[model samples]
Target chain A: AGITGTWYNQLGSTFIVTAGADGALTGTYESAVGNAESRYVLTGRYDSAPATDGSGTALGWTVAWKNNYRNAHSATTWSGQYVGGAEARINTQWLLTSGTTEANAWKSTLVGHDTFTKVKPS
Target chain B: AGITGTWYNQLGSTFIVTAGADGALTGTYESAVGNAESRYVLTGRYDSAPATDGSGTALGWTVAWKNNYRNAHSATTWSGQYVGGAEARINTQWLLTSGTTEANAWKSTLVGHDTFTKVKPS
Candidate 1:
């Protein structure tokens, strides 16, 4: 089992995810009203570098997610900084790569605010 | 059976339509330069009320088009005022409703400008 969390984008859209055994991630994005859903797979790693003060450390991660909508699919890449704690806040950028028959055609960039709650490992 | 015309949105995207015999509309939307294509079906009616001044009668119509791209699809509703005599100028709006996996999720509004030259009906 991996980490699970809730993600919210700039458009106020929310998504949920469960990381892979190795810490990789996979999840589904839900519309604000929960009427629509998009599945996403994330491939990336995490890094933890201690700061000089040694009080806390700077945390960050880079990941990309692909939204699958039947015949259309769009990919978004996100890089964000995280604060250490049980409840971590994440700031991410979403980019639309390809979807439907439009591959890298129309591009839209969006910012996202997300949070992840750590759960006890079973 | 129907009418054929070219439409342009505010974003400079062009859409082509071949209306049915009953005056209903159906066609495909192409991205600028024709890289991406989205199929749309329009259902509406056209009215030509004669104006008292007898200049152009203020031509206008309301119609909705659905974009089909693989597993994702979005519908846009548009209403525009047209200028008569061959090359007609049209203004339309595009709304994103549903798509691959994401139904009524995120909504983005866009405006379109289009031009159409009357073609001889075969």
Candidate 2:
């Protein structure tokens, strides 16, 4: 469970993740989200997508997670680039797509821009 | 995992949670956070804290999450209130604690104001 661990934001919410070897990165999204219930279970598989614009050295990986909450299913995809050196940066976002009707209108369509650092037990 | 689920912030970050029946909530943090690696695992227990000033009917709850990011084990406590009905808001924020040295100045000391909606599988 390397990259697949707990990631956090400025505030106090998070993502419990499990990045598999086959690039099957799946986990849950825990936050103060809108229009939903609790415990948003999610799953994602890494793909070949471009990283953030003007960012790290990642051919980048495209991963998509399907989560259900408040009796609705929504899909979110993240395009990230993992630059391994000093500034190990992992950038991701809720990419634009045919996101569900209720999903699209629920949260920000621009959730496609999140930069993060990986952490885990020593 | 009801209150303990993946929650999100406005800027595209998140929290992966697991709120136990005994008021024991645990999980990980995922976000575009700065100064750390990814997948910061955390643990917390809910208590009777105050909710948002004037929003919802919550004597409120205080939940503390013990997390380690970038070799720093910081503690974050969220005081929330559950207003059982429409506009059910779970308000929480990082309370003041004599946290770890490196942990203290790591993230924002004021991660204590978040309103969220829960999400989970159908």
Candidate 3:
């Protein structure tokens, strides 16, 4: 039940996730950006156990925005940690890439950072 | 020059890393355990640019401790973030898997966590 819950970032994006015994993850992401009403499919994984005690859990996930929004042809990947203690939070950095075949593929690839707090626990 | 530096964790483990333009990481990890005197090779990657501003960087790396110590047959992987601020730190979770063929393979797999502060920057 570490990361299986509802999370919200500073950007107002909401993440809902469920974890499997093998650390497999299935989730939904509702962005504050385009198509705020739609929930995109998310898939990822996490470290069920860590080498250090009381630190946190390492996790990585991705979202493919096929039709989540108008003309969306992008995908985003996130990596971060879920620290549960006085203040349970997930700090992450993400990359979103779209139109990779465009002349300015570099410009289309965006990087962002986020910190999410659990609004609801599983 | 985010994570390209020398870092020391609370447990006295030492990490030294250098990054490439493409976000390729090459470094060494001298753990406080196993063999304290040897430097094991480390390879990893980091997000060169994040989408959110001033949030820090996400990174992951691995160390293969082959013969670095007595009866060493373990490899460790780490995932975390390097935040550049008043005090730069790498907060990470790690998993060390060894003796997978052993009867107690699950017991041989270890998990730990760490927070590293920069000792020297590149």
Candidate 4:
């Protein structure tokens, strides 16, 4: 079984996922506001070799995937990518973008921003 | 004379500034969550020529500035830059990085992320 976890957007939106074989990932997301929720399945393939710094192989991975949602949002769909790297086994950077919309629009829009990350579960 | 504006961190922290001559800036910041506030003085100087795209100017100014607070958090300080451009006049891209800590850590850390943008105040 691949590493499984829950992801959240800046607006408190929640997503659950299961990383599959060969770096494939599938998940579902629900908005924290209103009654908006969506089911999405995505597969991520590494586009570049992992960055090296002489330690263990960094968890830095670049992923490209698609998302589909339901309800009154017109099933908004898009393809985007994310780049993540590990630091101190607890730090990671996951930059995501699909066209002009970010992976997390609620938080970004509220603060006029973009980008997200995955940290060790505390 | 230079343009002056207020800056905010990820945790609803507010900072006011008056950009002085020669790319120098001095200001004060207050926290929105707590009854905490601090005075800070900073100077930002350009590191590279502005990025252009045949327009008048791209406003993609890479800045390096220092900040000193007067409260808890040990008067945390850092230097960073923001790459911003006019996507529509109301749209600008401001990417900031100051050492390991971002210009906005409260918001970034809350979501396991980094980065901020200066948008047209609505």
Q: Which candidate is the best by TM-score?
A: 3
Interface RMSD of 1: 6.5
lDDT of 1 by residue, A20-75 (tens): 45444455655445545444444554433335352332223333443444433435
TM-score attained by chain A of model 1: 0.48
Off by over 4 Å in 2: A33-37, A47-69, A84-88, A96-111, A118-122, B1-122
lDDT of 1 by residue, B56-114 (tens): 32222333343444433445455554455555454333333334334323323323333
- Model 4, B1-122: lDDT tens per residue? 21356555554545555655445545554534244433344434432343455433222222233334332332223334444444222122334332335534523321122233343223
lDDT of 3 by residue, A1-122 (tens): 76888888886788889966645567777875335547766655556544343544656565655432443444566656667766888766665544332244325446567779876432
lDDT of 4 at A79: 30
Write the residue-wise lDDT of candidate 2 on B1-122 in tens digits: 33555665444446666755533445655544332445544443332221233322221121122223332212233333333345333443333222222232233233234555543212
- The 10-residue segment of model 1 chain B with minimum total lDDT is B54-63
* Model 2 whole-model lDDT (C-alpha atoms): 0.37
Where in model 3 is the C-alpha error above 4 Å? A33-37, A120-122, B1-122
* lDDT agreement of model 3 with the native: 0.61
TM-score for each candidate, following the candidate numbering:
0.33, 0.33, 0.47, 0.30
Give the per-residue lDDT digits (tens) of candidate 2, residues A6-109: 66543444566675553344556665432344455444333212123322222112112222323222223343334444544444432322222222333322
Candidate lDDT scores, in order, read 0.44, 0.37, 0.61, 0.37
Q: Model 4 misses residue B85 by how many Å?
A: 11
List model 3 lDDT by residue over B92-115, tens digit each.
666554423224433544556777
Using lDDT, give the best candidate's number. Answer: 3
